Swiss-Prot record, chain C:
It is found in: Secreted, Extracellular space, Extracellular matrix. The record marks 5-6 as: Cleavage. The modification 4-hydroxyproline is found at residue 16. Trimers of one alpha 2(I) and two alpha 1(I) chains. Interacts with MRC2. Interacts with TRAM2. Interacts with MFAP4 in a Ca (2+)-dependent manner. This is Collagen alpha-1(I) chain. Type I collagen is a member of group I collagen (fibrillar forming collagen). It comes from Homo sapiens. Coiled coil: none annotated. It is linked to Caffey disease: An autosomal dominant disorder characterized by an infantile episode of massive subperiosteal new bone formation that typically involves the diaphyses of the long bones, mandible, and clavicles. The involved bones may also appear inflamed, with painful swelling and systemic fever often accompanying the illness. The bone changes usually begin before 5 months of age and resolve before 2 years of age. Forms the fibrils of tendon, ligaments and bones. In bones the fibrils are mineralized with calcium hydroxyapatite. The gene is COL1A1. Belongs to the fibrillar collagen family. Contains mostly 4-hydroxyproline. Proline residues at the third position of the tripeptide repeating unit (G-X-Y) are hydroxylated in some or all of the chains. The C-terminal propeptide, also known as COLFI domain, have crucial roles in tissue growth and repair by controlling both the intracellular assembly of procollagen molecules and the extracellular assembly of collagen fibrils. It binds a calcium ion which is essential for its function.
């Protein structure tokens, strides 16, 4: 059988 | 069901 | 069942 739904979007990267 | 849900994403890369 | 979901996709980088 297939695998689970893809994980939640990760939080944005920082600037300087 | 397949899987429930994948693990949440971690942060993006920081500044330079 | 299925195994777990694919991991969450990381967020978007900053800048100089």
């Amino acid at each position: 059988g297939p695998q689970g739904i893809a994980g939640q979007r990760g939080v944005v990267g920082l600037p300087g």
